[PDB]
Amino acid sequence: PLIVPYNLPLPGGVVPRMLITILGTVKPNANRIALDFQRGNDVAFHFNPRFNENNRRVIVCNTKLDNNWGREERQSVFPFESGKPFKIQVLVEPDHFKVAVNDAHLLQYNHRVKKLNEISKLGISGDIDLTSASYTMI
Numbered sequence: 001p002l003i004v005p006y007n008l009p010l011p012g013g014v015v016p017r018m019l020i021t022i023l024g025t026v027k028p029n030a031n032r033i034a035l036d037f038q039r040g041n042d043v044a045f046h047f048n049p050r051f052n053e054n055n056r057r058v059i060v061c062n063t064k065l066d067n068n069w070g071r072e073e074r075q076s077v078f079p080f081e082s083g084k085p086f087k088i089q090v091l092v093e094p095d096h097f098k099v100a101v102n103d104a105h106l107l108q109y110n111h112r113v114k115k116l117n118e119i120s121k122l123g124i125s126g127d128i129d130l131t132s133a134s135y136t137m138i
């Protein structure tokens with residue numbers, strides 16, 4: 001297994017057709033999960049399942065530029081479950097990140113950070129046991 005928070009280098013940055021696969025298990029009584037695709041200090045794509053935001057489960061997605069969070073994009077489909085194993089697949093497409101969880105399409109996130117070559121690492125954090133994190137080309 002992998003220590004969380006975990007950094008996955010993305011050598012040479014992201015490109016369309018790159019597929020990131022993450023396997024893990026949500027801890028009991030989880031509060032949050034986060035994926036942070038980073039361009040230096042900036043967060044090109046933040047994907048943040050929140051298990052209890054005012055008694056609602058929601059995924060928040062956003063971008064952080066110069067330490068400022070932008071406009072949140074929120075999705076109430078919520079495919080994660082405390083205590084249970086999951087698979088996240090993030091496919092880089094030309095104009096968005098496309099995310100599927102447990103083989104079902106979840107959401108798309110339009111590229112705000114357009115220098116995809118410079119998005120050179122992925123941080124994986126939160127209330128999970130992390131089994132594996134890797135990438136391939138499709």
Ligand SMILES: CC(=O)N(c1cccc(C(=O)O)c1)[C@@H]1O[C@H](CO)[C@@H](O[C@@H]2O[C@H](CO)[C@H](O)[C@H](O)[C@H]2O)[C@H](O)[C@H]1O
Nearest residue numbers: 034046047048060061062063064068069070071072073
């Ligand atoms: C205005 C306000 O209180 N918040 C906010 C900030 C930026 C964008 C929106 C929006 O589009 O509705 C709202 C809240 O600001 C906090 C602090 O930045 C947010 O929490 C942060 O959210 C980012 C992702 O956006 C990230 O997960 C941070 O880790 C987290 O602290 C909160 O969600 C906003 O409601």
